[PDB]
Every structure is written in C-alpha cells, then in structure tokens.
C-alpha cells in the first residue's frame, strides 16, 4: 500500500480533504478529493484566499478563532512554534459550478488542523470534512 493509497482511504472514510493555508488564509495546498466533495480543482484553490470561498459573514469569526488559537504558542518565532493541540471549527465553503447561471451553493464543513512552521513562515495544515450543524 502506497502513501497516496493510504490517504485516499482515510480521507474517503472522513469525507475530507487536506488543506494548508498561511495565516492570512492564502491557500498553498489542497489534496485531490476536494473535487468530489466541492467540485473545485485543487488548482482553483491554490494561490487564492480561503476567504474567497467562505461567505463574508463568517470571515470575522474564522480569523478570530485561528488567531486566538495561534496565540497559544508560547513564542511566535517560527523555528520555535509548534501547536500544542488541534484547532476545530466549522463554516461554509463555496462549491464549484459548471453553470454560472446557477446560483452559488455551499457545503458546511469542519476544519481540524494545527499551526506549523514551513521549510520560516507560519502555516495551518488541516483536514476539511463534510459536516452538519
């Protein structure tokens, strides 16, 4: 069993995909299953902001809850960061469209992730799954 096969099965069982953002929400990575869960290609997401896909009324609380969580690191110097434990939150994400005449549709999803320094930058690596409220 390959690395890629294992993550296929785990993310299938979760109904989820992998996502990595910078602290301003800029998207640097998305795994292939976002297509069957949201009908975006990963390349439509990478280099865009996560907030381009979150309804505006949610932005304040998502950023607040991420910021507040990052403050739990004792220092913010990237070499010495390490998330103490996982962050959890839910929100909507816009779906892709074959028909732009159609009105916009959204999936309610749950994030689970951690801050982690790259390479030094601070990024949030997460699993995003379908959820219900």
């Amino acid at each position: 069993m390959s690395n890629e096969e294992f993550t296929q099965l785990m993310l299938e069982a979760l109904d989820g995909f992998f996502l990595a953002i910078m602290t301003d929400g800029s998207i640097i990575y998305v795994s292939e299953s976002v297509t069957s869960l949201l009908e975006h290609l990963p390349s439509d997401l990478v280099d865009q902001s996560i907030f381009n896909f979150i309804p505006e009324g949610e932005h304040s609380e998502v950023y607040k809850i991420l910021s507040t969580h990052l403050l739990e690191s004792d220092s913010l110097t990237p070499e010495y960061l390490k998330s103490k434990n996982q962050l959890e939150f839910c929100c909507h994400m816009l779906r892709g469209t074959i028909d732009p005449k159609e009105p916009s549709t959204y999936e309610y999803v749950k994030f689970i992730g951690n801050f982690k320094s790259l390479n030094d930058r601070v990024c949030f690596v997460a699993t995003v799954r379908l959820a219900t409220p």
Side-chain angles (χ1 to χ4, degrees):
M1 167 176 310
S2 56
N3 296 323
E4 208 159 79
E5 283 154 3
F6 171 83
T7 56
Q8 198 277 337
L9 290 156
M10 141 180 288
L11 295 172
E12 249 199 74
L14 297 168
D15 288 316
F17 58 98
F18 283 150
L19 176 84
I21 56 161
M22 313 303 269
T23 64
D24 68 348
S26 165
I27 302 172
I28 71 189
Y29 171 85
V30 185
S31 68
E32 61 90 26
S33 39
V34 75
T35 301
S36 75
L37 296 150
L38 299 189
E39 313 178 77
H40 302 292
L41 282 207
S43 64
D44 308 323
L45 297 189
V46 168
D47 304 310
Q48 306 284 306
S49 178
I50 194 64
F51 298 104
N52 285 115
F53 302 88
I54 309 185
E56 182 179 284
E58 285 175 349
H59 293 192
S60 185
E61 289 279 279
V62 175
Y63 194 74
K64 192 167 171 89
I65 215 164
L66 289 161
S67 300
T68 305
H69 186 70
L70 177 51
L71 286 179
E72 298 184 4
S73 267
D74 301 315
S75 65
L76 302 175
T77 171
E79 165 206 345
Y80 302 120
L81 181 82
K82 189 38 139 34
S83 212
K84 313 214 151 25
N85 46 40
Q86 302 199 279
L87 174 67
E88 214 185 87
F89 72 87
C90 324
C91 71
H92 297 77
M93 282 186 67
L94 171 91
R95 302 186 48 94
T97 166
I98 288 319
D99 188 341
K101 181 209 54 186
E102 211 215 332
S104 288
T105 62
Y106 301 84
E107 302 286 329
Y108 192 77
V109 293
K110 175 190 284 165
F111 285 55
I112 317 172
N114 298 84
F115 292 102
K116 169 93 190 53
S117 44
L118 286 173
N119 184 105
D120 283 306
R121 315 284 324 258
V122 177
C123 75
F124 192 70
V125 295
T127 313
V128 188
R129 321 152 65 196
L130 302 176
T132 45

Short mmCIF file of all heavy atoms in Angstrom, two decimals, residues 6-33:
data_model
loop_
_atom_site.label_atom_id
_atom_site.label_comp_id
_atom_site.label_asym_id
_atom_site.label_seq_id
_atom_site.Cartn_x
_atom_site.Cartn_y
_atom_site.Cartn_z
N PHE A 6 -2.99 5.11 1.07
CA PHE A 6 -3.44 5.24 2.45
C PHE A 6 -4.27 6.51 2.65
O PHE A 6 -5.34 6.47 3.27
CB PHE A 6 -2.26 5.23 3.44
CG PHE A 6 -2.69 5.57 4.83
CD1 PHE A 6 -3.22 4.59 5.67
CD2 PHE A 6 -2.65 6.88 5.28
CE1 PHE A 6 -3.66 4.91 6.94
CE2 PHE A 6 -3.10 7.20 6.56
CZ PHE A 6 -3.59 6.22 7.39
N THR A 7 -3.76 7.66 2.17
CA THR A 7 -4.50 8.91 2.38
C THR A 7 -5.81 8.90 1.59
O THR A 7 -6.80 9.50 2.02
CB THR A 7 -3.64 10.15 2.02
OG1 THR A 7 -3.13 10.08 0.67
CG2 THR A 7 -2.44 10.28 2.97
N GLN A 8 -5.87 8.19 0.46
CA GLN A 8 -7.15 8.07 -0.23
C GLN A 8 -8.18 7.43 0.68
O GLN A 8 -9.31 7.92 0.80
CB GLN A 8 -6.98 7.27 -1.53
CG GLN A 8 -8.11 7.44 -2.55
CD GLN A 8 -9.31 6.54 -2.26
OE1 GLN A 8 -9.20 5.51 -1.58
NE2 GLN A 8 -10.48 6.93 -2.76
N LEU A 9 -7.80 6.35 1.37
CA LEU A 9 -8.77 5.63 2.18
C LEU A 9 -9.19 6.43 3.40
O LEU A 9 -10.37 6.48 3.75
CB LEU A 9 -8.18 4.27 2.60
CG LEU A 9 -8.01 3.22 1.50
CD1 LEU A 9 -6.94 2.20 1.86
CD2 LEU A 9 -9.33 2.52 1.21
N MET A 10 -8.22 7.07 4.06
CA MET A 10 -8.53 7.82 5.27
C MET A 10 -9.46 8.98 4.94
O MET A 10 -10.50 9.16 5.58
CB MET A 10 -7.23 8.30 5.92
CG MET A 10 -7.28 9.71 6.51
SD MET A 10 -5.70 10.14 7.24
CE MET A 10 -5.74 9.07 8.69
N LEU A 11 -9.11 9.74 3.91
CA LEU A 11 -9.90 10.89 3.52
C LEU A 11 -11.25 10.47 2.96
O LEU A 11 -12.23 11.21 3.13
CB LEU A 11 -9.14 11.74 2.49
CG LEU A 11 -7.85 12.39 2.99
CD1 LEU A 11 -7.10 13.04 1.82
CD2 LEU A 11 -8.14 13.43 4.07
N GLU A 12 -11.32 9.31 2.30
CA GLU A 12 -12.62 8.78 1.88
C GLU A 12 -13.50 8.52 3.09
O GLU A 12 -14.66 8.93 3.13
CB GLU A 12 -12.47 7.49 1.09
CG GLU A 12 -12.80 7.60 -0.38
CD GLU A 12 -13.09 6.24 -0.99
OE1 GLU A 12 -14.17 5.68 -0.72
OE2 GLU A 12 -12.22 5.72 -1.72
N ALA A 13 -12.96 7.78 4.06
CA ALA A 13 -13.72 7.48 5.27
C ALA A 13 -14.13 8.75 5.99
O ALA A 13 -15.20 8.81 6.61
CB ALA A 13 -12.88 6.59 6.21
N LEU A 14 -13.30 9.79 5.94
CA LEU A 14 -13.65 11.05 6.58
C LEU A 14 -14.63 11.88 5.76
O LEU A 14 -15.31 12.73 6.34
CB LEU A 14 -12.39 11.87 6.86
CG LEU A 14 -11.42 11.20 7.83
CD1 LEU A 14 -10.06 11.91 7.85
CD2 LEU A 14 -12.01 11.10 9.24
N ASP A 15 -14.75 11.63 4.44
CA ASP A 15 -15.37 12.59 3.51
C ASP A 15 -14.64 13.93 3.61
O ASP A 15 -15.25 14.98 3.84
CB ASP A 15 -16.86 12.79 3.78
CG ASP A 15 -17.69 11.59 3.37
OD1 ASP A 15 -17.45 11.06 2.28
OD2 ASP A 15 -18.58 11.19 4.15
N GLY A 16 -13.32 13.89 3.47
CA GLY A 16 -12.50 15.04 3.75
C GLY A 16 -11.41 15.23 2.73
O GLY A 16 -11.16 14.38 1.87
N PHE A 17 -10.75 16.38 2.84
CA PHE A 17 -9.58 16.68 2.03
C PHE A 17 -8.59 17.43 2.90
O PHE A 17 -8.93 17.95 3.97
CB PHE A 17 -9.94 17.47 0.75
CG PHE A 17 -10.65 18.78 1.01
CD1 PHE A 17 -9.94 19.96 1.02
CD2 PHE A 17 -12.02 18.82 1.22
CE1 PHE A 17 -10.58 21.18 1.24
CE2 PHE A 17 -12.66 20.04 1.45
CZ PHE A 17 -11.93 21.22 1.45
N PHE A 18 -7.35 17.43 2.44
CA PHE A 18 -6.24 18.07 3.12
C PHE A 18 -6.10 19.50 2.61
O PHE A 18 -6.28 19.77 1.42
CB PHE A 18 -4.93 17.31 2.85
CG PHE A 18 -4.78 16.03 3.65
CD1 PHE A 18 -4.05 14.95 3.14
CD2 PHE A 18 -5.34 15.92 4.91
CE1 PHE A 18 -3.91 13.77 3.89
CE2 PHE A 18 -5.20 14.76 5.66
CZ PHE A 18 -4.49 13.67 5.15
N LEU A 19 -5.78 20.42 3.52
CA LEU A 19 -5.68 21.83 3.19
C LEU A 19 -4.60 22.52 4.01
O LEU A 19 -4.47 22.29 5.21
CB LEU A 19 -7.03 22.54 3.41
CG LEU A 19 -7.08 24.05 3.20
CD1 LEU A 19 -7.29 24.34 1.71
CD2 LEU A 19 -8.18 24.68 4.02
N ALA A 20 -3.82 23.37 3.36
CA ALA A 20 -2.79 24.15 4.04
C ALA A 20 -2.95 25.60 3.65
O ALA A 20 -3.03 25.92 2.45
CB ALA A 20 -1.38 23.65 3.69
N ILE A 21 -3.03 26.48 4.66
CA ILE A 21 -3.17 27.91 4.44
C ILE A 21 -2.06 28.63 5.19
O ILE A 21 -1.48 28.10 6.14
CB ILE A 21 -4.56 28.44 4.88
CG1 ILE A 21 -4.83 28.08 6.35
CG2 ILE A 21 -5.65 27.92 3.95
CD1 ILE A 21 -5.93 28.94 6.98
N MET A 22 -1.76 29.85 4.73
CA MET A 22 -0.98 30.80 5.52
C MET A 22 -1.90 31.51 6.51
O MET A 22 -3.13 31.36 6.47
CB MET A 22 -0.27 31.83 4.64
CG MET A 22 0.47 31.28 3.44
SD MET A 22 1.68 30.07 3.97
CE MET A 22 3.10 31.12 4.19
N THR A 23 -1.30 32.32 7.39
CA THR A 23 -2.07 32.90 8.49
C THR A 23 -3.07 33.94 8.02
O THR A 23 -4.04 34.19 8.74
CB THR A 23 -1.15 33.53 9.55
OG1 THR A 23 -0.42 34.63 8.99
CG2 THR A 23 -0.19 32.49 10.10
N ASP A 24 -2.87 34.53 6.84
CA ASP A 24 -3.88 35.39 6.21
C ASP A 24 -4.90 34.59 5.40
O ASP A 24 -5.73 35.19 4.71
CB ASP A 24 -3.22 36.45 5.32
CG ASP A 24 -2.55 35.84 4.07
OD1 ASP A 24 -2.40 34.61 3.99
OD2 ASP A 24 -2.17 36.61 3.15
N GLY A 25 -4.84 33.26 5.41
CA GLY A 25 -5.84 32.50 4.69
C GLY A 25 -5.43 32.09 3.30
O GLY A 25 -6.21 31.39 2.62
N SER A 26 -4.26 32.51 2.84
CA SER A 26 -3.83 32.22 1.49
C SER A 26 -3.57 30.72 1.35
O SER A 26 -2.94 30.10 2.21
CB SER A 26 -2.59 33.05 1.16
OG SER A 26 -1.94 32.54 0.02
N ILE A 27 -4.08 30.12 0.29
CA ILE A 27 -4.08 28.67 0.14
C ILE A 27 -2.83 28.22 -0.59
O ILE A 27 -2.55 28.68 -1.70
CB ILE A 27 -5.34 28.20 -0.59
CG1 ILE A 27 -6.58 28.65 0.18
CG2 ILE A 27 -5.29 26.66 -0.75
CD1 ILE A 27 -7.91 28.40 -0.56
N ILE A 28 -2.09 27.30 0.02
CA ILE A 28 -0.88 26.80 -0.62
C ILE A 28 -0.98 25.35 -1.03
O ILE A 28 -0.17 24.91 -1.86
CB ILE A 28 0.38 27.03 0.26
CG1 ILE A 28 0.38 26.12 1.49
CG2 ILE A 28 0.56 28.56 0.58
CD1 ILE A 28 1.46 26.46 2.47
N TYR A 29 -1.94 24.59 -0.51
CA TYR A 29 -2.06 23.18 -0.86
C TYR A 29 -3.49 22.72 -0.63
O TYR A 29 -4.14 23.14 0.34
CB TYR A 29 -1.11 22.30 -0.02
CG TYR A 29 -1.37 20.82 -0.21
CD1 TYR A 29 -0.80 20.12 -1.26
CD2 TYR A 29 -2.19 20.12 0.65
CE1 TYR A 29 -1.03 18.76 -1.44
CE2 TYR A 29 -2.43 18.77 0.48
CZ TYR A 29 -1.85 18.10 -0.55
OH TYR A 29 -2.09 16.77 -0.69
N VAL A 30 -3.96 21.85 -1.51
CA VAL A 30 -5.26 21.19 -1.43
C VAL A 30 -5.10 19.82 -2.09
O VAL A 30 -4.53 19.72 -3.17
CB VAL A 30 -6.38 21.99 -2.13
CG1 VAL A 30 -7.69 21.31 -1.90
CG2 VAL A 30 -6.47 23.38 -1.59
N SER A 31 -5.58 18.78 -1.43
CA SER A 31 -5.49 17.44 -2.00
C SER A 31 -6.66 17.17 -2.95
O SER A 31 -7.70 17.84 -2.91
CB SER A 31 -5.45 16.40 -0.89
OG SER A 31 -6.70 16.33 -0.21
N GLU A 32 -6.48 16.13 -3.78
CA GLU A 32 -7.34 15.88 -4.94
C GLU A 32 -8.81 15.63 -4.58
O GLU A 32 -9.68 15.83 -5.42
CB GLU A 32 -6.81 14.67 -5.74
CG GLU A 32 -6.76 13.34 -4.93
CD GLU A 32 -8.06 12.52 -5.03
OE1 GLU A 32 -8.77 12.68 -6.06
OE2 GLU A 32 -8.38 11.74 -4.09
N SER A 33 -9.12 15.18 -3.36
CA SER A 33 -10.51 14.83 -3.08
C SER A 33 -11.42 16.04 -2.95
O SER A 33 -12.63 15.87 -2.88
CB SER A 33 -10.64 13.99 -1.81
OG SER A 33 -9.75 14.41 -0.79
#
